[PDB]
Design a protein around this ligand. Structure first.
Ligand SMILES: Cc1cc2nc3c(=O)[nH]c(=O)nc-3n(C[C@H](O)[C@H](O)[C@H](O)COP(=O)(O)O)c2cc1C
Ligand SMILES: [Cl-]
Length: 308
């Protein structure tokens, strides 16, 4: 069995989506990118009410929320440009996560500064027992990409995710499978293929096809999982209505901010946002209003009473 990974996605990658992807067969779940400058201000809070581990900012906002169900499968992705700050964030979350990822697709800007990438990654590798990973974008020239990935490997990281697109490449531009294959061949660490949604990934069987075309260790899915998290289910895609209700149940059970639930459902609805249900969802001013838009009003009242 080759690993099915939920790609890190800002706003999308909150707890309900990670748990939903796990239900449908994802082996590893990356969280949304969280900026180190925000994380360093947080305190670890055990939440008995929700049975979660919360990372709470001084304004009482829960920045990251995790639970036991995903403890051995959640990869924390940080946005960082400083090694000491990166390590302090890693030290905060390491007991509640299975991996620490560094965003290098801060982000794309880091690829132009390999001394910084190297400093941050080597500091993380030496500072935590958790496997350290990074997610990169391919460089304009193959030789530069190959030198870069070898230099990153020499830091001691556990694996590398490769989005087969260059910094200036829009989602409409095709992915470079041949470049991902060149990286996988030159490295002894696992290489995770990425950048395959829509153009290559529309159904489950497409995942293994993308892995074989890139000769990679595993596949990381973003857009296709965002549109329908049941993309990870070997038996085939589940009806969207069924997936959205399953999503809302987790959003309510783990007290997800209604604007975040609304955003994730909007991403799944796509063209169906013009339907009466898509309209009810856009108008929703609370979690109860999202639930009533999807026939989960009674579930909301029952769940709420138990949590209160
Ligand atoms: C809504 C959205 C948010 C994203 N946020 C992140 C992020 O937090 N971290 C990251 O490294 N990449 C982020 N990405 C990039 C994806 O992880 C991924 O590299 C890209 O979508 C290509 O994979 P795909 O073809 O499976 O969608 C984001 C992509 C989308 C669609
Ligand atoms: Cl990216």
């Amino acid at each position: 069995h080759h690993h099915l990974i939920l790609a890190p996605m800002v706003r999308v990658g909150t707890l309900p989506m990670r748990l939903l992807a796990l239900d449908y067969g994802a082996d590893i779940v990356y969280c949304e990118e969280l900026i180190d400058l925000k994380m360093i201000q947080c305190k670890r809070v055990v939440n008995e009410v929700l049975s979660t581990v919360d990372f709470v900012a001084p304004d009482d906002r829960v920045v990251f929320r995790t639970c036991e169900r995903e403890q051995n499968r959640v990869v924390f992705q940080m946005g960082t440009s400083d090694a000491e700050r990166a390590l302090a964030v890693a030290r905060l979350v390491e007991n509640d996560v299975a991996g620490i990822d560094v965003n290098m697709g801060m982000g794309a800007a880091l690829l132009s500064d390999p001394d910084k990438i190297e400093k941050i990654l080597s500091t993380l590798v030496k500072g935590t027992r958790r496997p350290v990973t990074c997610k990169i974008r391919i460089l304009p020239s193959l030789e530069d990409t190959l030198s870069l990935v070898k230099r990153i490997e020499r830091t001691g990281i556990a694996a590398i995710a490769v989005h087969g697109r260059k910094r200036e490449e829009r989602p409409q531009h095709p992915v470079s499978c041949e470049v991902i294959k060149a990286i996988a061949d030159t490295l002894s660490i696992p290489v995770i293929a990425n950048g395959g949604s829509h153009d290559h990934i529309q159904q489950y069987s497409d995942i293994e096809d993308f892995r074989q075309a890139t000769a990679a260790s595993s596949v990381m899915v973003a857009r296709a999982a965002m549109w329908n998290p049941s993309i990870f289910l070997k038996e085939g895609l589940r009806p969207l209505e069924e997936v959205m209700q399953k999503y809302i149940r987790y959003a309510v059970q783990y007290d997800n901010h209604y604007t975040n639930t609304k955003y994730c459902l909007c991403q799944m609805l796509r063209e169906q946002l013009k339907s009466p249900q898509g309209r009810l969802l856009h108008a929703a001013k609370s979690s109860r209003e999202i639930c009533e838009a999807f026939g989960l009003g009674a579930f909301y009242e029952e769940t709420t009473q138990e949590l209160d």
